[PDB]
């Protein structure tokens, strides 16, 4: 159960650089890839994973031979611990030898849309809430969202963009909570929404920003608990336009303000005993609810799916070849892939892709090395994942 938020009540920012006020934007990183190994003539799903961007507004289109693909589904948007947003667009498709696919992204951080072509050569637990408030001049009321996570698995979500917005289960094991829970969480969310609506207004004044621009407030709030059930760490951190604003220190008693506007918030909260209020929530309410949720989803929350790995072989100019080690169908996302040349791990030549969602609950990742033609048997790929009885070791098999 998320905490009830207290307004920030900012002061003049005196902006002369980085503050959370008028954010310097983050450029989207894009990966375009299929969910399953591509086989000409076989139905598949093409994914366009977009990450690391800010502001949250973004336009994504998928293209086939240069023409917009009509039905492209979009996952709900989320953001990461570094405040940046991410989303997954995907479409059903049947690849052929000559059809070209691409993903085009328009975002305020770039002068023009970026088009990326699909190339297919071959113990401890936590309860965290990620909150987003985004003003939208000319597009309606501010959008407000509360997204809850138990150990990185989304389990609840409230999104104001509806006629009767309500807290909703995002994990099937939450269906164990009765009507009272949903009703209470929903009303609390609607109350929190009001506090953020007010803060968006006052921050504009503090940062001397135009009433015509869109701005974002983000919060990460929650607790991390050990296997013995004791609180390991408590979190209450805010960001304005993607930049740190104010955060509760690990002592759960003091605040760290990031700019002059936040200094005023700190003083107000100091005088009002806000840290004391958060400490109580973090050490009690937060931990108690986390225990309840962990009970509710128990096995689901400790599940693993081991990676299925294989190495593919690709030509290069002259006497070189690329060996690519693939890890597919694994869960959770944490994984390590390495390449070794007779006992040593390679850094120099290795290329990697950020771990990405297959779109079915599992993840994918690959790591490659460029090696001399004829020396493929001198290299071995190593795959490390918590679901494996032991690390996988593999080599190119012609």
The CB density around residue 220, as the number of other CB atoms within 10 Å, is 19
Strand boundaries in 107-167, DSSP class E: 114-117, 125-134, 143-150, 153-159
CATH number of 24-122: 2.60.40.10
Given in angstroms, what resolution was this structure solved at? 1.8
Which stretches within the chain are classed as H helix? Answer: 179-206, 260-272, 274-280, 286-302
DSSP type of residue 283: I
State the Cα–Cα distance between residues 324 and 346, nearest whole angstrom: 13
143 near 160, Cβ under 8 Å? yes
Q: What is the DSSP letter of 108?
A: T
* Rounded Cα distance, 379 and 345, in Å: 10
Give the residue among 256, 197, 210, 202 at the shortest CA–CA distance from 9.
202
CB-side neighbour CA atoms (13 Å) of 127: 24
Question: What is the topology classification, in CATH, of domain 123-303?
Answer: 3.30.500
| Residues in the chain after which the backbone breaks (C–N beyond 2.5 Å) | 122
Alpha-helix runs per DSSP H in 273-374: 274-280, 286-302
Bridge partners (DSSP) of residue 223 are: 127, 234
CB 359 within 8 A of CB 35: yes
CB 94 within 8 A of CB 84: no
For the domain with range 304-398, which CATH number is right: 3.40.50.620, 2.60.40.10, 3.65.10.10, 1.20.1250.20? 2.60.40.10
> Could you check whether 24-122 and 123-303 share the same CATH topology?
no
Q: Residue 164 contacts by C-beta under 8 Å, 6 or more apart in sequence?
A: none
Question: CB of 70 within 8 A of CB of 63?
Answer: no
CB atoms within 10 A of CB 47: 23
Query: Which run of H or E residues covers position 50?
Result: strand 44-53
Token reading at 373: 């033609």
Q: Which two tokens stand for residue 374?
A: 């004829």
Name residues whose C-beta falls within 8 Å of residue 360's C-beta, 6 or more positions apart in sequence: 35
Strands (DSSP E) contained in 69-124 are: 73-74, 78-79, 85-93, 101-106, 114-117
How far is it between the farthest Cα atoms of the chain?
72
- Exposed e or buried b for every residue in 92-124, given b needs 16+ CB within 10 A? ebebeeeeebbbbbebebeeeebebebeeeeee
> How many other CB atoms are there within 10 angstroms of residue 181's CB atom?
15
Q: How far apart are CA 208 and CA 100, in angstroms?
A: 47
Tokens standing for residue 98: 């000559």
Q: Which long-range contacts (CB under 8 A, 24 or more apart) does 187-191 make?
A: 188/1, 188/2, 188/4, 189/2, 189/144, 189/146, 189/158, 189/165, 190/165, 191/4
CA distance 24 to 241: 8
Q: What is the total residue count of the chain?
A: 398
Residues 6+ apart with CB under 8 A from 194: none
Neighbours of 125 (CB within 10 A): 19
Distance CA 116, CA 82 (A): 24
* Cα–Cα distance measured from residue 122 to residue 313, given in angstroms and rounded to the nearest whole number: 8
d(CA 55, CA 328): 31
**CA–CA distances in Å: residue 290 to residues 137, 156, 222, 282, 366:** 37, 13, 9, 11, 34
Tell me the domain boundaries of the chain: 24-122, 123-303, 304-398
Distances (CA, A) of 145 to 134, 148, 200, 301: 9, 10, 14, 23
Task: Judge contact between 283 and 275, C-beta under 8 A.
Answer: no
Q: Which tokens go with 47?
A: 């994914």
CA angle 384, 321, 345 (to 5 degrees): 35
Query: Rounded to whole angstroms, how far apart are CA atoms 160 and 146?
Result: 9
Residues 6+ apart with CB under 8 A from 359: 35, 45, 47, 88, 90
H or E stretch at 252: none
Q: Tokens 């072989």 label which residue?
A: 313
The whole-angstrom separation of Cα 41 and Cα 98 is 11
Nearby residues of 278 by Cβ (< 8 Å), 6 or more positions away = 3, 234, 236, 248, 252
Picking from 350, 345, 341, the residue whose alpha carbon sits closest to that of residue 395 is 341
Instruction: Look at residues 53, 61, 60 and name the one whose alpha carbon lies nearest to residue 78.
Output: 53
- Residue 325, phi-psi category: left (phi > 0), alpha (psi -120 to 50), beta (remainder): beta
What's phi and psi for 139, nearest 5 deg? -135, 20
Q: Does residue 369 contact residue 340 with C-beta atoms inside 8 Å?
A: no
Token code pair at residue 191: 């109350």
d(CA 283, CA 321): 55
């Amino acid at each position: 159960s998320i905490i009830n938020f207290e307004k920030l009540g900012c002061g003049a920012s005196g902006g002369g650089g980085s503050g959370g006020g008028g954010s310097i934007q983050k450029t989207p990183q894009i990966q375009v890839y299929s969910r399953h190994p591509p086989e000409n003539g076989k139905p598949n799903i093409l994914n366009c994973y977009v990450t690391q961007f800010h502001p949250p507004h973004i336009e994504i289109q998928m293209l086939k031979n240069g023409k917009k693909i009509p039905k492209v589904e979009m996952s709900d948007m989320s953001f990461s611990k570094d405040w940046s947003f991410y989303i997954l667009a995907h479409t059903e498709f049947t690849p052929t030898e000559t059809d070209t696919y691409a993903c085009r992204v328009k975002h305020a951080s770039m002068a023009e849309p970026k088009t990326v072509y699909w190339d297919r050569d071959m113990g401890p637990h936590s309860l965290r809430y990620f909150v987003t408030a985004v003003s939208r001049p000319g597009l309606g009321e501010p959008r407000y969202m509360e997204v809850g996570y138990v150990d990185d698995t989304e389990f609840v979500r409230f999104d104001s963009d509806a006629e009767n917005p309500r807290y909703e289960p995002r994990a099937r094991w939450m269906e164990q909570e009765g009507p009272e829970y949903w009703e209470r969480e929903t009303q609390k969310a609607k109350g929190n929404e009001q506090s953020f609506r007010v803060d968006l207004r006052t921050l504009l004044g503090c940062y001397n920003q135009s009433k015509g621009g869109s701005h974002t407030i983000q919060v990460i709030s929650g607790c991390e608990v050990g296997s013995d059930g004791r609180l390991l760490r408590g979190y209450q951190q805010y960001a304005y336009d993607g930049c740190d604003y104010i955060a509760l220190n690990e002592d759960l008693k003091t605040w760290t303000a990031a700019d002059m506007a936040a200094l005023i918030t700190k003083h107000k909260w100091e005088q009002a005993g806000e840290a004391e209020r958060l400490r109580a929530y973090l050490e009690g309410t937060c931990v108690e609810w986390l225990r309840r949720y962990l009970k509710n989803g128990n096995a689901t929350l400790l599940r693993t799916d081991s990676p299925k790995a294989h190495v593919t072989h690709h030509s290069r100019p002259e006497d070189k070849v690329t060996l690519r080690c693939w890890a597919l169908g694994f869960y959770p996302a944490d994984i390590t892939l390495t390449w070794q040349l007779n006992g040593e791990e390679l850094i120099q030549d290795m290329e990697l892709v950020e771990t990405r969602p297959a779109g079915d609950g599992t993840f994918q990742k690959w790591a490659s090395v460029v090696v001399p033609l004829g020396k493929e048997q001198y290299y071995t790929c190593h795959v490390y994942h918590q679901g494996l009885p032991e690390p996988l070791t593999l080599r190119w098999e012609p």
